């Protein structure tokens, strides 16, 4: 599809297959968090609890591969609120890296207007900063502006 390349689907498949012990194309309900972690994202235990009910309310203990993909595909559907904010941010990630320099995030905060004092903005920078890169994430930052 145009929303994601088949190359990305490969990683979703490898991360899933890493826990598909039986080879039936399935993982356990609890292994869902581990598959997502293998893709580099760590979901909250609270949301994970509800994610399981929407697939296996009876508690059989498994989630299949097309269900795992359907869960992702459900969130991937267009929404007006998150996409509007993301539009402005797309021009700042020059490398397609997901992380941008804190100096560049600081520019966005200044350009957006109503910029709070540096100490108030630091609260958000602190959580987003990665010591290995010296960069702050921009993508989850956008979602943090509208959800918590």
From Swiss-Prot:
GO cellular component assignments: calcium channel complex; calyx of Held; catalytic complex; centrosome; cytoplasm; cytosol; extracellular region; myelin sheath
Gene label: CALM1
Keywords: Acetylation, Calcium, Cell projection, Cilium, Cytoplasm, Cytoskeleton, Disease variant, Flagellum, Host-virus interaction, Isopeptide bond, Long QT syndrome, Metal-binding, Methylation, Phosphoprotein, Repeat, Ubl conjugation
Modified residues (N6-methyllysine): 115
Protein name (database record): Calmodulin-1
Species name: Homo sapiens
Residues covered by the EF-hand domain: 7-42, 43-78, 80-115, 116-148
Outcome of mutating residue 140 to G: In LQT14; decreased calcium affinity; loss of CACNA1C calcium-dependent-inactivation; no effect on intracellular RYR2-mediated calcium release
Activity regulation remarks: (Microbial infection) Inactivated by S.flexneri OspC1 and OspC3 proteins, which specifically bind the apo-form of calmodulin, thereby preventing calcium-binding and activity.
Positions of Ca(2+) 4 binding: 129, 131, 133, 135, 140
Chain residue numbers at which the record places covalent cross-link Glycyl lysine isopeptide (Lys-Gly) (interchain with G-Cter in SUMO2): 21
Illness the protein is tied to: Ventricular tachycardia, catecholaminergic polymorphic, 4: An arrhythmogenic disorder characterized by stress-induced, bidirectional ventricular tachycardia that may degenerate into cardiac arrest and cause sudden death. Patients present with recurrent syncope, seizures, or sudden death after physical activity or emotional stress. CPVT4 inheritance is autosomal dominant. Long QT syndrome 14: A form of long QT syndrome, a heart disorder characterized by a prolonged QT interval on the ECG and polymorphic ventricular arrhythmias. They cause syncope and sudden death in response to exercise or emotional stress, and can present with a sentinel event of sudden cardiac death in infancy.
UniProt modified residues of type N6-acetyllysine: 21, 94
Outcome (variant: residue 129 to G): In LQT14; reduction in calcium affinity; not changed protein abundance; not changed structure; significantly decreased thermal stability in presence of calcium; significantly decreased RYR2 interaction; increased ryanodine-sensitive calcium-release channel activity; decreased of KCNN2 calcium-activated potassium channel activity; not changed KCNN2 expression; not changed KCNN2 location at membrane
Effect after changing residue 140 to V: In LQT14; loss-of-function variant causing impaired negative regulation of high voltage-gated calcium channel activity; impaired regulation of cardiac muscle cell action potential; decreased calcium ion binding
Chain positions with N-acetylalanine modification: 1
Top-level lineage group: Eukaryota
Binding residues for Ca(2+) 3: 93, 95, 97, 99, 104
